[PDB]
Coordinates of C-alpha atoms and ligand atoms in Angstrom, one line a residue:
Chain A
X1 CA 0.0 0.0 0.0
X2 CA 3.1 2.5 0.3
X3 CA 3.4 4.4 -2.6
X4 CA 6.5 7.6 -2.5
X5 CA 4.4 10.9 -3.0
X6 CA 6.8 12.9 -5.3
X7 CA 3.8 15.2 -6.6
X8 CA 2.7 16.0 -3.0
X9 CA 6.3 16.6 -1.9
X10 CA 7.4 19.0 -4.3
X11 CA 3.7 21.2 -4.3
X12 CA 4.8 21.1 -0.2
X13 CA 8.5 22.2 -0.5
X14 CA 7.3 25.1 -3.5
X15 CA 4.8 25.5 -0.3
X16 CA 7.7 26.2 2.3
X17 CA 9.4 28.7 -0.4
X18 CA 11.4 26.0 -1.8
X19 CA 13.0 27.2 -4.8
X20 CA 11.6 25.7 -8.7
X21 CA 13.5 22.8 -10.2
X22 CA 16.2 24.6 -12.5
X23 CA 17.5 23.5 -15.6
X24 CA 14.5 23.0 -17.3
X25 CA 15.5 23.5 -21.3
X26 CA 14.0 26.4 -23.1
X27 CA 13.8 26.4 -26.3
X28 CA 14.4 28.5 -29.1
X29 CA 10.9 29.5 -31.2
X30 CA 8.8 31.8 -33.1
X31 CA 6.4 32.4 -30.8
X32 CA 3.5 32.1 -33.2
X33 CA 2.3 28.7 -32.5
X34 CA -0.4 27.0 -32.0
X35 CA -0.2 27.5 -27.7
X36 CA -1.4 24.0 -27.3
X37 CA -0.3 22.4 -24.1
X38 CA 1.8 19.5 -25.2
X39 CA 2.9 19.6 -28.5
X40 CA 5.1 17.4 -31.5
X41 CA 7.6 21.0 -32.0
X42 CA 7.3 24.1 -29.9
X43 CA 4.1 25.4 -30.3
X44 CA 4.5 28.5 -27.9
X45 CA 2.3 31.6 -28.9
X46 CA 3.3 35.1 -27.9
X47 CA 2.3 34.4 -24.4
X48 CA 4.3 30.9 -23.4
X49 CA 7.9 29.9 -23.6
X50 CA 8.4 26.0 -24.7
X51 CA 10.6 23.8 -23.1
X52 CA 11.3 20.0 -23.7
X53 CA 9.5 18.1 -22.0
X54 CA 11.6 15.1 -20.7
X55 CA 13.3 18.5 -18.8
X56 CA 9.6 19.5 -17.2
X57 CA 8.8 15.9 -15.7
X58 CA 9.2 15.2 -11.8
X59 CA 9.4 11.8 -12.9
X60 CA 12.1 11.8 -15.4
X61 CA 13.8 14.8 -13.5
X62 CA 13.6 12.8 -9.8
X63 CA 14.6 9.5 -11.3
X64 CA 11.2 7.7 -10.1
X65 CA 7.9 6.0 -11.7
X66 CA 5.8 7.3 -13.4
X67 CA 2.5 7.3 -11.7
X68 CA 0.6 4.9 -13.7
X69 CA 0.4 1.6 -15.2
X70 CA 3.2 0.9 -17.9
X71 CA 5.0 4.0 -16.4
X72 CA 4.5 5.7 -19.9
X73 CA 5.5 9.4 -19.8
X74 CA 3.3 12.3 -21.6
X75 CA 6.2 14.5 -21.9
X76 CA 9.7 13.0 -22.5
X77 CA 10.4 13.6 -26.6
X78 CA 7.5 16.2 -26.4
X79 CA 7.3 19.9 -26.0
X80 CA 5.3 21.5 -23.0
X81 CA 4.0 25.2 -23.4
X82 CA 4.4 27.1 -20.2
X83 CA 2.8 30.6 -19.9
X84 CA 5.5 33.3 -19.2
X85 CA 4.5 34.2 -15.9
X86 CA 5.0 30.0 -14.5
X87 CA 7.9 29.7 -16.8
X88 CA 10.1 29.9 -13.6
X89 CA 8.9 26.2 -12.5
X90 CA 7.8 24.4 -15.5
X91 CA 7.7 21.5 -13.4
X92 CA 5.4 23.0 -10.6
X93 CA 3.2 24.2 -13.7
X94 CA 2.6 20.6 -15.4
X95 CA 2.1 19.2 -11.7
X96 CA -0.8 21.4 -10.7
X97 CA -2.1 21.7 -14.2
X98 CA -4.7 19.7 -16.8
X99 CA -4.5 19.7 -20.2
X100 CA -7.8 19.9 -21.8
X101 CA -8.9 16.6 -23.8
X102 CA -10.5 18.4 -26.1
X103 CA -9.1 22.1 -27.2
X104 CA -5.3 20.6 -26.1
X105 CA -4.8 24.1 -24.5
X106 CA -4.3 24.3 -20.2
X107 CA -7.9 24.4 -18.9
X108 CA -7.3 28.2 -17.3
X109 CA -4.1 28.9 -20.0
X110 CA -5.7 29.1 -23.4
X111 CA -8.9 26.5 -22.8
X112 CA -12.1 28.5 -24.0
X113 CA -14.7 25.3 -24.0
X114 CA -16.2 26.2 -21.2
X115 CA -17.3 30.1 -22.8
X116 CA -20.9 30.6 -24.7
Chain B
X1 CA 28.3 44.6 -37.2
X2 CA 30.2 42.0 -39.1
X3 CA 28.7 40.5 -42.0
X4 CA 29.3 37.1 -40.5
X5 CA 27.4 38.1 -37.4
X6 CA 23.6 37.5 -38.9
X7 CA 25.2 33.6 -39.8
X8 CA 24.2 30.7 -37.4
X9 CA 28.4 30.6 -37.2
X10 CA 31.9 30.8 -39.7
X11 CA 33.0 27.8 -41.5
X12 CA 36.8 27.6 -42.6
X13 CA 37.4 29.0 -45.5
X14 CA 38.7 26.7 -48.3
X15 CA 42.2 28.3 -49.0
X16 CA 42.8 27.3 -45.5
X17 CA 42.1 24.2 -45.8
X18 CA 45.2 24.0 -48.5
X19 CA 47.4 25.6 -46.4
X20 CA 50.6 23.5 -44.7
X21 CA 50.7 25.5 -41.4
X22 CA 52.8 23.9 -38.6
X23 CA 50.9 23.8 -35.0
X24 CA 51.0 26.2 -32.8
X25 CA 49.4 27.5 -30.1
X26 CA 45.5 28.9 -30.4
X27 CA 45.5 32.4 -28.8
X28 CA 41.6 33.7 -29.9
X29 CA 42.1 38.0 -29.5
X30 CA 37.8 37.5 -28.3
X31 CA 38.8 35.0 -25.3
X32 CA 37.1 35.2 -22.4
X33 CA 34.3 37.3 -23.7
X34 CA 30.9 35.5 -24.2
X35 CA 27.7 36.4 -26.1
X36 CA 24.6 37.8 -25.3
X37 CA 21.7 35.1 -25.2
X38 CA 18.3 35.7 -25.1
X39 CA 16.5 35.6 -21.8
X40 CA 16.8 32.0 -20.1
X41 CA 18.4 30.5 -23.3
X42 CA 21.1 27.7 -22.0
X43 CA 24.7 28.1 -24.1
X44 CA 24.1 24.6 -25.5
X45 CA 20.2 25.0 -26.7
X46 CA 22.5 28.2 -28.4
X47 CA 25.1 26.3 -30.1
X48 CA 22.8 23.2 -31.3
X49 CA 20.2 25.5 -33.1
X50 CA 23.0 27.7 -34.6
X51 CA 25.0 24.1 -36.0
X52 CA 21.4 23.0 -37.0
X53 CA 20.6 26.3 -38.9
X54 CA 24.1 25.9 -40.4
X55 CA 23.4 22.2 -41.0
X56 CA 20.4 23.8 -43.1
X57 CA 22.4 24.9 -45.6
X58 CA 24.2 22.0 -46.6
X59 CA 23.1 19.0 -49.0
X60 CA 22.1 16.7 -46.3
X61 CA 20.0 13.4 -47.2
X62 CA 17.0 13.6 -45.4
X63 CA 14.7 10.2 -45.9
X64 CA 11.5 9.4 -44.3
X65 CA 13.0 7.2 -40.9
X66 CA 15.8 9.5 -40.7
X67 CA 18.0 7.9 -38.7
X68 CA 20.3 10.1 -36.1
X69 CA 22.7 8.9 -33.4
X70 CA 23.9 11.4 -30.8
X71 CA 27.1 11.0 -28.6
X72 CA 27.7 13.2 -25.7
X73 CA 23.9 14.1 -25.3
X74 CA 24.7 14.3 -21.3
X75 CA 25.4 17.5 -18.9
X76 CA 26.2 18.5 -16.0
X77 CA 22.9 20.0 -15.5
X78 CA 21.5 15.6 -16.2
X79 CA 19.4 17.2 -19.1
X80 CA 20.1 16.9 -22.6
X81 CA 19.8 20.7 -24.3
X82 CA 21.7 19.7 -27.6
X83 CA 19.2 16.5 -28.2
X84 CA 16.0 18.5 -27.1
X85 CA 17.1 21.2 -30.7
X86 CA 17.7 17.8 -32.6
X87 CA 14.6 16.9 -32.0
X88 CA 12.9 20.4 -32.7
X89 CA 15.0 20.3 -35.7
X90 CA 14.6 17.1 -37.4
X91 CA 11.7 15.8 -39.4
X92 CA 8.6 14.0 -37.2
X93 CA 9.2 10.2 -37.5
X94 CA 13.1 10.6 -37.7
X95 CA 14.4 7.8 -35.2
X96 CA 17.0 9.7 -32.6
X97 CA 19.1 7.8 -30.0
X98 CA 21.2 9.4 -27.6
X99 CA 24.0 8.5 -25.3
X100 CA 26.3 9.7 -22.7
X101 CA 28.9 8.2 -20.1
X102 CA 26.9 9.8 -17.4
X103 CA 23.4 9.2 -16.6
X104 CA 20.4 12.3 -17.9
X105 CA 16.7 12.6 -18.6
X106 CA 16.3 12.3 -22.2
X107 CA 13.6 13.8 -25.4
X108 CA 15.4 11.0 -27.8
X109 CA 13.4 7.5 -28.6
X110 CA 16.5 6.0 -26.9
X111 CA 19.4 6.7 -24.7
X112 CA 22.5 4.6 -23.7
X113 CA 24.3 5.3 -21.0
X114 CA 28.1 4.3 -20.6
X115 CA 31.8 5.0 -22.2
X116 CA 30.9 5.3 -26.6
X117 CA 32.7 2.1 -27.0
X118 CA 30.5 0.1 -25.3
X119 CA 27.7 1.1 -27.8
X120 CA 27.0 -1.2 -30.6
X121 CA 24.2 -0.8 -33.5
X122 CA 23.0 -3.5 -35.7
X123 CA 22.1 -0.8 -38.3
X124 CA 24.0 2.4 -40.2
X125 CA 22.8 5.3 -39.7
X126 CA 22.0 8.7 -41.6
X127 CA 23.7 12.0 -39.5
X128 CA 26.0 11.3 -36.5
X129 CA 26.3 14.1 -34.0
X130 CA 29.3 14.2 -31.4
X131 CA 29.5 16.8 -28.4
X132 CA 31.7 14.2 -26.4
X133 CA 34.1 16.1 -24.8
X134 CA 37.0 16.1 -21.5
X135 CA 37.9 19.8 -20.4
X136 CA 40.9 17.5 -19.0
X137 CA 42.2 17.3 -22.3
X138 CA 43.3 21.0 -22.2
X139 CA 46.9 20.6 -21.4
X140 CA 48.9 23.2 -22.2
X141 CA 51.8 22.2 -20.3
X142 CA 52.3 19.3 -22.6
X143 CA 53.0 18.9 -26.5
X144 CA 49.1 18.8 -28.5
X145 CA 49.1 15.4 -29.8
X146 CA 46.3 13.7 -31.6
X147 CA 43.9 12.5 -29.2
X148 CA 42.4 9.2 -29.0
X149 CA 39.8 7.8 -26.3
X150 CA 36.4 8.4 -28.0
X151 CA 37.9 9.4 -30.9
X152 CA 39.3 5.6 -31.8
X153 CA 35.6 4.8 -31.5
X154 CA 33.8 7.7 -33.9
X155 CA 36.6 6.5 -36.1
X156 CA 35.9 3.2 -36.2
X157 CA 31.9 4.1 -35.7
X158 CA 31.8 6.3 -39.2
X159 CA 33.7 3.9 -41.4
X160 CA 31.4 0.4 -40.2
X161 CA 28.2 2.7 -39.0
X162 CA 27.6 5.1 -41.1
X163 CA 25.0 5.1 -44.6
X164 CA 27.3 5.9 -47.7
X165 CA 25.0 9.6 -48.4
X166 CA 25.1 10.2 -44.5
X167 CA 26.7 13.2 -42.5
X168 CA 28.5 13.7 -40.0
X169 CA 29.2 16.9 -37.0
X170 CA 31.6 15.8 -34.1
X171 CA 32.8 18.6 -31.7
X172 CA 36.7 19.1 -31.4
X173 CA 38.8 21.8 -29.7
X174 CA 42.3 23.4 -30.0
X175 CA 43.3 19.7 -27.5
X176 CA 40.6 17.6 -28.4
X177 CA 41.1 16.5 -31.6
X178 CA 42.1 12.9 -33.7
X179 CA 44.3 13.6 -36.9
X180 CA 42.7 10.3 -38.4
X181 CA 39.5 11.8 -37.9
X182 CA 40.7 14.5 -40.4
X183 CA 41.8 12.4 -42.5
X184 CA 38.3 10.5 -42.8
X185 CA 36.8 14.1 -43.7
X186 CA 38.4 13.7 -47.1
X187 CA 36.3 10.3 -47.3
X188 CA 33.0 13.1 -47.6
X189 CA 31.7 14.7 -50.9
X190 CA 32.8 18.1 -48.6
X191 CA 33.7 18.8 -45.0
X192 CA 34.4 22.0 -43.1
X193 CA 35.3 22.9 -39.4
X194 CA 32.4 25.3 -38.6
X195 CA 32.7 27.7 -35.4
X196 CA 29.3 28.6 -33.8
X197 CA 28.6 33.1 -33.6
X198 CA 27.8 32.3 -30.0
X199 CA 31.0 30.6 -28.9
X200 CA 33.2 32.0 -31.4
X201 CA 35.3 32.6 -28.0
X202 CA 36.4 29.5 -28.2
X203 CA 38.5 26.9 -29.9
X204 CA 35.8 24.8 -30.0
X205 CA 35.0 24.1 -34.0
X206 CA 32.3 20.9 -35.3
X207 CA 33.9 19.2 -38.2
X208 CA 31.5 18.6 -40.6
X209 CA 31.4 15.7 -43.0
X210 CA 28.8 16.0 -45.7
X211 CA 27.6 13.0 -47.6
X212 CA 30.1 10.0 -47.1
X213 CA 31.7 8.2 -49.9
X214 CA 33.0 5.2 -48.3
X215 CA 36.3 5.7 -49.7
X216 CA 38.8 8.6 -49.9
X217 CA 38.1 11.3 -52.2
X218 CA 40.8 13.4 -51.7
X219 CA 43.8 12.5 -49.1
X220 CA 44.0 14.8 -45.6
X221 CA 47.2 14.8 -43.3
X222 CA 45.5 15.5 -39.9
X223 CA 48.2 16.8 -37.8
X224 CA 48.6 19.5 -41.1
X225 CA 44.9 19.8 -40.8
X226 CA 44.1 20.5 -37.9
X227 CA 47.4 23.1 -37.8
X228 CA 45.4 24.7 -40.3
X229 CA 42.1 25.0 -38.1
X230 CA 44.3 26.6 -35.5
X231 CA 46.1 29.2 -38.2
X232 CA 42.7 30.4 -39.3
X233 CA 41.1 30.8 -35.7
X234 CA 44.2 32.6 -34.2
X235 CA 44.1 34.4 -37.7
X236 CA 40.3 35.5 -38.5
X237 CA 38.7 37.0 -35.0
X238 CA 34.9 36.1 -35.1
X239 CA 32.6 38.3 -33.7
X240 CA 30.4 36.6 -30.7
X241 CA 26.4 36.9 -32.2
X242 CA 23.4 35.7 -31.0
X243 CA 21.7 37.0 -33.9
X244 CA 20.6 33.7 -35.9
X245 CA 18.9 32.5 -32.3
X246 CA 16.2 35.5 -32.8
X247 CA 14.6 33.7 -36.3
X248 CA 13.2 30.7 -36.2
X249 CA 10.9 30.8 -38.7
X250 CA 12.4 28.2 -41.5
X251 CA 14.6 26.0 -38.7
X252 CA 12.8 22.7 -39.1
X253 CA 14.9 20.3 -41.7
X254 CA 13.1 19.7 -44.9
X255 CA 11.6 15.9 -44.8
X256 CA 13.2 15.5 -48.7
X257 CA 12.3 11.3 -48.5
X258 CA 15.8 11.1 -50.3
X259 CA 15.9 7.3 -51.9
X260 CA 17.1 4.7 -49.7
X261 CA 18.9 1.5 -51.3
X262 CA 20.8 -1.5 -50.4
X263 CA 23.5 -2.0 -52.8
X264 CA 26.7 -3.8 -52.4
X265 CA 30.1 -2.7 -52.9
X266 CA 30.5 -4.0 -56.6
X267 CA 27.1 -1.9 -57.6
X268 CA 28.6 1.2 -56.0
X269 CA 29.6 3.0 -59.8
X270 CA 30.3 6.8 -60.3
X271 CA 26.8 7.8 -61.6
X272 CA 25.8 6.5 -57.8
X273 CA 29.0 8.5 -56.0
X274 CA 27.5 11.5 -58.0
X275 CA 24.0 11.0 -56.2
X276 CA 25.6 10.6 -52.5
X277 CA 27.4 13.5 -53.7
X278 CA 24.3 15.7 -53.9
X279 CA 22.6 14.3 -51.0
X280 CA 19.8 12.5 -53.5
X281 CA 21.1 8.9 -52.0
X282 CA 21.1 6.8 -49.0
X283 CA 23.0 3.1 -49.1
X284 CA 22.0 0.9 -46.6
X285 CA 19.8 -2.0 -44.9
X286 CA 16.2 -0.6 -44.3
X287 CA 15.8 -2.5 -41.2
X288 CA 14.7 -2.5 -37.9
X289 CA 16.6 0.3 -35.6
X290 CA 18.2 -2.4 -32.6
X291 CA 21.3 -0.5 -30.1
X292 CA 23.1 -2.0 -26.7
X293 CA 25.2 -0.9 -24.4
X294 CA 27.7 -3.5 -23.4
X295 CA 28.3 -4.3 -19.6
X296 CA 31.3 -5.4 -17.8
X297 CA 30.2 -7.7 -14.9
X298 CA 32.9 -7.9 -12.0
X299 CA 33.7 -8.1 -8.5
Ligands
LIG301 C1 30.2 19.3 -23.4 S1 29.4 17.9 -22.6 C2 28.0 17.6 -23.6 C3 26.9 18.7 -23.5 C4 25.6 18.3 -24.2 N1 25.9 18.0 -25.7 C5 24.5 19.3 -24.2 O1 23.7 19.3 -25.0 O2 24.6 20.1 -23.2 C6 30.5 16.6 -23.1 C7 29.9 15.2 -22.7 O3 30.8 14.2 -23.3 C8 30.7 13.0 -22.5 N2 31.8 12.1 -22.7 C9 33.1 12.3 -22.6 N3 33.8 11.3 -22.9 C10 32.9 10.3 -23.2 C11 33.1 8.9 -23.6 N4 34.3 8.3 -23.7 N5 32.0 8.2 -23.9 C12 30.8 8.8 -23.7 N6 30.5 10.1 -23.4 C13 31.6 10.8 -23.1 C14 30.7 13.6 -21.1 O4 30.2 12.7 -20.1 C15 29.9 14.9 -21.2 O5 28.5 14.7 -20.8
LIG302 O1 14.0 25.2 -14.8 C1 13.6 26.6 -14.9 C2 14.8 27.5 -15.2 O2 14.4 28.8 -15.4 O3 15.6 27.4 -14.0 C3 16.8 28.2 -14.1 C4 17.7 27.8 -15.3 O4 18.2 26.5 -15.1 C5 16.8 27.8 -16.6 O5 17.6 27.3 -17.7 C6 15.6 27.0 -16.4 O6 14.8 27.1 -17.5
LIG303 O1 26.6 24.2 -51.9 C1 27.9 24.0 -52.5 C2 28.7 23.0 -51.8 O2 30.0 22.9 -52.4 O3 28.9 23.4 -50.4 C3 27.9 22.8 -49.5 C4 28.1 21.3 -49.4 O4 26.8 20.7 -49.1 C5 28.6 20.7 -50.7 O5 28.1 19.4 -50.9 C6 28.1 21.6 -51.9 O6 28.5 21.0 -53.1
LIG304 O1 23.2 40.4 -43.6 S1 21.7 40.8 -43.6 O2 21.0 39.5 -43.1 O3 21.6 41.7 -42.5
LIG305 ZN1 8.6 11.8 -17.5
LIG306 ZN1 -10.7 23.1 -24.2

């Protein structure tokens, strides 16, 4: 029944003014993309920075299991959009965010379902 | 300011590269300055998308399962900057494996970790990129030999590993460098030593082999070679630019599906050498992608 809590322990130590994980990769892009949340290439619009996402994973970044079945990552050899007021903890971001299932954009980032 | 400064970087001019310089020490008049990135951009996400956008501009065969093999993909930092631009750059559905002596979180479909000689591939492959590198080898209380170490193994990696058509960019410095890796330039359709605009500080240079012949189409002397290298950098100041970072707008590498084949040695005629020449040609076994990393067990 023990299961390590990585999630929960970083949201606490960013809690206690821990500061972000660092070296997350930025890369390099026009700026005129799509803003989708998760992307193939860099897809940041005017309003994000992209990173790669193997760099923005607790999991990859912590050396420990992904939390699910298979352990498959939804980042790693992907590129994840960060808006550029959170792109000082990409990691915190993707922890505390969803991606929306339908749009692709951050539900509260870019997803507009939800408007008339 | 410079004309070169809105390039991705400087490639050596070809007189140079006819020259017969003897060695000597490299002495850059810009050492110790460094360029201006944009905000939050790492030095090495720098230099991979200005070799990439340099890379651009050559004939490079691009099929559909590109096939690219990274060495020194690792860091300090236990991220891989240089793999995460390969993978912006190339073409979706290219196959990119990465490896490293030291253990980092990867974007590539595969990463090794352990020495370079302990990787082994059942397939050739299309581009080979090298950052491997050992500050350690900067020594300059001692003559500057030709190195060997991971050198011996890109050697030996190019000539067995590498699809006739395919390219090559390995890192090297004022110390690390392998005259017989030189000489294996001359065994391309055309090579250069190109010096990225952001680290034009240093001695660092990638040598570039474009669209390998499997055999020696002109012959190099390394140690003269890389004399040469040094002569032009400690010769030709290059002015530190950031400038190429700041458009990205045609970076991704053109998918071109260039022809793959599996021809043997006997088939391998000039009209063929002309169309690995252009980058129109690949030669090799369209099989499946398998990679290991040998282990030493002990006690
Ligand atoms: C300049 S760092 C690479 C930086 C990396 N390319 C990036 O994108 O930031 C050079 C790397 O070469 C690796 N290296 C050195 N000698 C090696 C060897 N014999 N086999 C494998 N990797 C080696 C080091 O472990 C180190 O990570
Ligand atoms: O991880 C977030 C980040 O801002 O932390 C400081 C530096 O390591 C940056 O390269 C990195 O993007
Ligand atoms: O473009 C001209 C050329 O000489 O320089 C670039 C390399 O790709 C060479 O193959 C090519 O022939
Ligand atoms: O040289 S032009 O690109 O400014
Ligand atoms: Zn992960
Ligand atoms: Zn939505």
């Amino acid at each position: 029944a023990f299961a390590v809590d990585a999630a929960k322990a970083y949201k606490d130590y960013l809690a206690s003014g821990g500061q972000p994980i660092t070296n997350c990769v930025k890369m390099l892009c026009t700026h005129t993309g799509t803003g989708q949340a998760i992307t193939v290439t860099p897809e940041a619009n005017m309003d994000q920075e992209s990173f790669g996402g193997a760099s923005c994973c607790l999991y990859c970044r912590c050396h420990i299991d992904h939390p699910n079945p298979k352990g498959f990552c939804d980042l790693k050899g992907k590129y994840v959009q960060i808006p550029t007021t959170c792109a000082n903890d990409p990691v915190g971001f993707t922890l505390k965010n969803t991606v929306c299932t339908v749009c692709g954009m951050w539900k509260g980032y870019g997803c507009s379902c939800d408007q008339l | 300011a410079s004309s070169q400064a809105w390039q991705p970087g400087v490639a050596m001019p070809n007189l140079y590269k006819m020259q017969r310089m003897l060695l000597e020490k490299c002495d850059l008049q810009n050492y110790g300055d460094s360029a201006t990135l944009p905000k939050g951009i790492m030095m090495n996400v720098a230099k991979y998308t200005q070799l990439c956008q340099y890379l651009n501009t050559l004939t490079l065969a691009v099929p559909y399962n590109m096939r690219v093999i990274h060495f020194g993909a690792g860091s300090d930092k236990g991220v891989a900057p240089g793999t995460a631009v390969l993978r912006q750059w190339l073409p979706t559905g290219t196959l990119l494996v990465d490896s490293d002596l030291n253990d980092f979180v990867s974007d590539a479909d595969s990463t090794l970790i352990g020495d370079c000689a302990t990787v082994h591939t059942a397939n050739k492959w299309d581009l080979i990129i090298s950052d491997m590198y050992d500050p350690k080898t900067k020594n300059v209380t001692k003559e500057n030999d030709s190195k060997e170490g991971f050198f011996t193994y890109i050697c030996g990696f190019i000539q067995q590993k590498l699809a006739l058509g395919g390219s090559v960019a390995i890192k090297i410095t004022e110390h690390s460098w392998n005259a017989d890796l030189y000489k294996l330039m001359g065994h391309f359709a055309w090579w250069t030593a190109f010096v990225t605009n952001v680290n034009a500080s240093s001695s660092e240079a990638f040598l570039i082999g474009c669209n390998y012949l499997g055999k020696p189409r002109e012959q190099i002397d390394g140690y003269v070679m890389h004399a040469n290298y040094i002569f032009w950098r400690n010769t030709n100041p290059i002015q530190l630019s950031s400038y190429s970072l700041f458009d990205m707008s045609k970076f991704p590498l053109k998918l071109r599906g260039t022809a793959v084949m599996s021809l043997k040695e006997g088939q391998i005629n000039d009209m063929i050498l002309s169309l690995l020449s252009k980058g129109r040609l690949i030669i090799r076994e369209n099989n499946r992608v398998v990679i290991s990393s040998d282990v030493l067990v002990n006690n």
